[PDB]
Amino acid sequence: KVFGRCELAAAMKRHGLDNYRGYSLGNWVCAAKFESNFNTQATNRNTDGSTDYGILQINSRWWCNDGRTPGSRNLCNIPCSALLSSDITASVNCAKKIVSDGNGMNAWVAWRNRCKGTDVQAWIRGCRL
Numbered sequence: 001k002v003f004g005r006c007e008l009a010a011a012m013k014r015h016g017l018d019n020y021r022g023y024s025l026g027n028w029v030c031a032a033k034f035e036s037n038f039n040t041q042a043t044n045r046n047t048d049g050s051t052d053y054g055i056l057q058i059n060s061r062w063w064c065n066d067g068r069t070p071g072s073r074n075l076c077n078i079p080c081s082a083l084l085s086s087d088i089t090a091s092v093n094c095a096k097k098i099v100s101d102g103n104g105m106n107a108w109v110a111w112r113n114r115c116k117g118t119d120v121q122a123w124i125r126g127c128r129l
Contacts, residue, residue: 001086003038005029006127008055013129015092021099026120028095031111032056033123040086054083054091056108063094 003011009029012018018025035057036042044052050061050069060069064080076097082090098107105111 001040003032003040003055005033005038005123006129008032008038009124009127010129011088012092015088017092017095020096021104023099023105024121026123027105027111027115029123030115030118030120031105031108034110034114035108040088040091041084043084051080053080055088056091056095057110058083058091058094058098063098 009025012025012028012032017023017028020028032038032055036055038055040055042054042057044057046052046059048061048070050059051066052059053064053066058064058076058080060066060080061071062073063076064078064083065072065074066080076090076094078090078094083094099105101107105116
């Protein structure tokens with residue numbers, strides 16, 4: 001599905017992504033807006049036969065399984081469908097494992113050229129939280 005801001009912000013809080021590894025909730029929400037405009041079925045297919053899936057556009061060459069992606073490291077140890085469900089749990093659970101490598105949120109392309117540097121906490125304001 002597609003989430004509203006607040007809905008995504010709240011789904012993101014219950015899941016405990018506020019100030020995760022130094023990342024305020026605002027950052028999670030912002031990366032979600034320019035990565036997929038909050039659609040959990042969003043999918044970009046790359047030249048190497050690899051695809052980016054879900055709300056945070058997680059690449060299957062590294063973190064998940066789809067059945068063909070090249071080296072397919074599957075660092076998160078998850079099937080990529082788990083990332084297309086409307087149940088955001090798996091992309092949340094993988095998100096914490098990605099941010100944890102010497103990359104931080106720089107791992108997200110939309111966050112680095114769009115969110116990095118701005119008052120990102122603006123993304124959870126006016127949400128009754």
